[PDB]
Structure 1
Amino acid sequence: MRKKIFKPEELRQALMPTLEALYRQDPESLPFRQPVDPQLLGIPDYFDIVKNPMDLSTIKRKLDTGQYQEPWQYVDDVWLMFNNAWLYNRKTSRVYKFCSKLAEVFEQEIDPVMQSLG
């Protein structure tokens, strides 16, 4: 119940490999690498449906700038990114299928890391 203290440099070192695993997926990571601009992309309802957008570059910036206090907050951001994509996109779309592949990759990477951090 009393939270152990995680130093930001320890979270960055431990969790960065799991984020690198996502980024290295090609073609599957491409639509997830940067924040979206709905007006430029032609999806103007995106922020109506997706209340809390999330993307790989934003997660990397949060690790780089010490914005997570505990590892589950990082896991929550990765899964927010996944859940937003499964909510917004149709099941036949590239983004939807790519999201499913990233979730498979992430599940394998994150488990031993979460065990090691405690």
Structure 2
Amino acid sequence: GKLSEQLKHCNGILKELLSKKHAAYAWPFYKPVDASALGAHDYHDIIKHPMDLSTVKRKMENRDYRDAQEFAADVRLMFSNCYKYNPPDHDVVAMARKLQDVFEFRYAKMPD
């Protein structure tokens, strides 16, 4: 029930990533990628392990993370799938990078 101090820190990061301050570049990450809606041909063949913020949020709220490294692994997977699928000049890759900079910096500030 009670998050560890490290996971509480991670829950703060999640709240920040979902906050209106970042909404102009965070929105593609709010729900699972809808490959048909985006015309992302073969998305689910190339990306074997989809991830997004609603899934990280559900895992956090259900107290399913066992440690902070698992949280970071999911958030990094979300960004990596984006980079993996898309070309470097795609608008979504720029948005991913802006959001990942928020993540990586705040994650680094996690209490030992």
Asked whether the two chains share a fold, i.e. TM above 0.5, the reply is: yes
Q: 1:44 to 1:56 in 2, by over 3 A?
A: same
SS of 2:109's equivalent in the other structure is helix
Corresponding position of 1:9? 3
Contact 1:28 1:99 survives alignment (8 Å):
yes
Q: In 2, Cα distance between the equivalents of 1:97 and 1:73? A: 25
Q: TM-score, normalised by structure 2?
A: 0.87
The count of aligned residue pairs is: 109
5+ residue gaps, structure 1, are 1-6
Query: Stretches of 4+ moved more than 3 A in 1?
Result: none
Matched, 1:29 2:41: no
Structure 2 residue identity aligned to 1:98:
M
CA RMSD of aligned residues (A): 1.6
> Whose Rg is larger?
1
What's the % identity of the aligned pairs? 35
Tell me the TM-score normalised to structure 1 length: 0.83
**What residue number does 2:64 align with?**
67
Worse-matched range after superposition: 13-22 or 52-61: 13-22
For the Cα contact (< 8 Å) 1:29–1:102, is it kept in 2?
yes
SS at match of 1:59: helix
- Change in CA separation of 1:72 and 1:8 when aligned onto 2, cut-off 3 Å: farther
Work out the CA distance in 2 between the residues paired with 1:27 and 1:57.
17
